[PDB]
Design a protein around this ligand. Structure first.
Ligand SMILES: C[C@@H]1CN(C(=O)[C@H](C)N2CCC(n3c(=O)[nH]c4ccccc43)CC2)C[C@@H](C)N1
Length: 571
């Protein structure tokens, strides 16, 4: 075994390029698919064959199914493995994806897993071209993932099509889930009334040996699944073998591939992602920027990411060194449900576990930090989320930006980008197959750290500055300095912006979740009041001009005054 008990060693001299939001990721994926020569391997939790990779759409030349069919007509063998949902309630419809991809061309061989009944899934997102170029991250080739820095809530207006999201691509996930995926070009929600839900995710492309290692992981999964069924054992799904016979503009770093696999998903057991996360947190010296879909830690819960975060914060406090922890989580889990009624079942469980990790209970980060340092915890940790506003139907509307990213940034020199959420199913390895990459910088660039000269890594500094600029209003506030991420002035500005934006959004939209609804009865009486956005739209619009960025403080006090199914499915 290699470092972090990983099947792959660190790969110095690796060309890697990061992507924020789905637009650039899909553009690079399409361009790489166009340049493919022999093989394309695809790993997805949900694949939409009819998704458009480049927008606005004026032709079918950039559709995933069309591009795969055209490349297969050139002699390229397209091996795809997909995840099969336990119940059809999960609207991925793996059967339709399999059937369409197979009907495209004989060279497109698609297999699905698991076949037996289990609580666990395949959450990995991977696309390998010629075993030389590997795209990974949290971005599936699925509906609603495509987005940009604008995070548009409206799409109202094929060679003259102005729609960025066509049919099933335009969706508000919490309002209504996908239905009837077999009809792609047909809207299931009204664009004129229901705003879209912005999507935020981070991916990365790696060139060279790490791509070969990701191809090796795909090959191991393919051969394991081949020797796991009857119809898949035929030569109609030939064996795949690796090769080590050894490009968009990126950066030269050192990239190590990490994964979470078990005997049910792959042939071996590995949990290198958890080890990498714990080592990066423990060895972090200045700051930790965490952007993850789920934050379930602080051992019902077994992973110890939160424990290491607490230990590092306490050690920084005792040693008296400057240290900031930025945590960004989506405001509500990615499920359909009415938050006015208090949410659904999965949403309630995920919120309960997240609040247990963060503030509720005695194992929570906030409780231990409080018992150690009083109210000083606000100077070391900052939990926030994203929300945006726009105009629709003559009135201001607002919606959270769903944080599907899985990224950790340490000291502007180390970056973990993957598909593994911070939860037991993705980090323990025993449950779900996940992929990630640890990227360390060998080339530095001048910057500031607590007011001192700091040789920050180019890749990590670029990623962190882009994240801060998008989260804040850098394009509208050119005076803000994003070079120093740990200093007192910048942290104070960050917290002030978060609190101000949360207050403004609550005042204007009366949105949920919020700290003004601490009980279910207060929540029920709170939704009876019509928000000012629909009362005096000019006044709310004038007030909203004070909103800077999309950052809003996380509602740690939402619903705070409140056995044949295991509790580990929502952890
Ligand atoms: C499928 C469609 C579209 N949906 C999504 O894409 C949303 C955003 N999900 C949220 C849950 C996420 N997830 C995870 O992290 N581990 C998982 C293990 C098993 C299943 C999901 C898992 C994946 C993305 C919402 C859904 C209700 N209907």
């Amino acid at each position: 075994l290699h470092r972090h008990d990983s099947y792959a060693p660190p790969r110095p001299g690796t060309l890697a390029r990061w992507f924020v939001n789905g637009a650039g990721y899909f553009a690079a994926v399409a361009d790489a698919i166009l340049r493919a020569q022999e093989e394309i391997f695809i790993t997805d939790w949900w694949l939409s064959p009819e998704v458009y990779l480049k927008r606005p759409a004026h032709s079918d030349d950039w559709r995933l199914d069309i591009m795969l069919k055209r490349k297969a007509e050139e002699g390229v063998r397209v091996s795809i493995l997909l995840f099969k949902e336990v119940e059809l309630a999960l609207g991925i419809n793996s059967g339709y994806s399999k059937r369409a991809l197979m009907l495209l061309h004989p060279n497109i061989k698609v297999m699905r897993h698991p076949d037996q009944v289990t609580l666990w899934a395949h959450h990995e997102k991977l696309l390998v071209v010629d075993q030389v170029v590997a795209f990974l991250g949290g971005l599936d080739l699925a509906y609603g993932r495509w987005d940009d820095l604008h995070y548009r809530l409206t799409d109202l207006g094929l060679s003259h099509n102005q729609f960025f999201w066509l049919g099933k691509d335009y969706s508000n996930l919490i309002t209504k889930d996908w239905v009837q995926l077999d009809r792609p070009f047909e809207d299931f929600i009204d664009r004129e009334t229901t705003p879209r839900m912005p999507w935020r995710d981070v991916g990365v492309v790696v060139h060279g040996l790490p791509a070969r290692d990701l191809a090796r992981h795909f090959i191991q999964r393919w051969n394991f699944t081949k020797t796991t069924k009857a119809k898949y054992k035929t030569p109609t799904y030939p064996y795949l073998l690796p090769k080590s016979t050894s490009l968009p503009g990126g950066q030269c770093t050192t990239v190590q591939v990490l994964r979470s696999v078990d005997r049910w998903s792959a042939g071996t057991l590995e949990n290198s992602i958890l080890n990498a996360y714990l080592h990066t947190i423990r060895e972090s010296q200045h700051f930790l920027y965490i952007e993850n879909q789920f934050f379930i830690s602080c051992s019902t819960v077994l992973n110890k990411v939160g424990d290491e975060i607490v230990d590092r914060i306490l050690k920084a406090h005792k040693q008296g060194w400057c240290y900031r922890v930025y945590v960004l989580l989506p405001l509500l889990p990615g499920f359909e449900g009415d938050i006015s009624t208090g949410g659904g079942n999965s949403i309630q469980a995920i919120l309960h576990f997240t609040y247990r990790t963060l503030c509720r209970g005695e194992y929570s980060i906030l409780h231990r930090l409080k018992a150690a340092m009083g109210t000083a915890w606000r100077d070391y940790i900052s939990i926030c989320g994203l929300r945006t506003h726009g105009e629709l139907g003559g009135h201001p509307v607002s919606e959270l930006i769903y944080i599907h990213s899985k990224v950790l940034i340490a000291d502007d020199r180390t970056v973990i980008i993957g598909s593994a959420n911070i939860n037991d199913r993705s980090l323990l390895g025993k449950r779900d197959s996940e992929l990630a990459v640890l990227i360390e910088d060998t080339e530095t660039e001048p910057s500031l750290m607590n007011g001192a000269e700091y040789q920050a890594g180019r890749f990590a500094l670029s990623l962190r500055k882009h994240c801060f600029g998008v989260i804040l209003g850098a394009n509208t506030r050119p005076d803000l300095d994003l070079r120093d991420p740990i200093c007192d002035d910048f942290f104070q500005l960050w917290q002030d912006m978060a609190e101000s934006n949360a207050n403004i959004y609550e005042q204007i939209f009366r949105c949920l979740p919020s700290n003004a609804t601490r009980s279910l009865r207060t929540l029920r009486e709170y939704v009876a009041v019509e928000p000012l956005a629909t009362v005096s739209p000019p006044l709310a619009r004038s007030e909203l001009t004070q909103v800077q960025g999309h950052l809003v403080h996380f509602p740690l006090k939402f619903l705070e005054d409140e056995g044949m199914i295991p509790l580990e499915v929502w952890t």
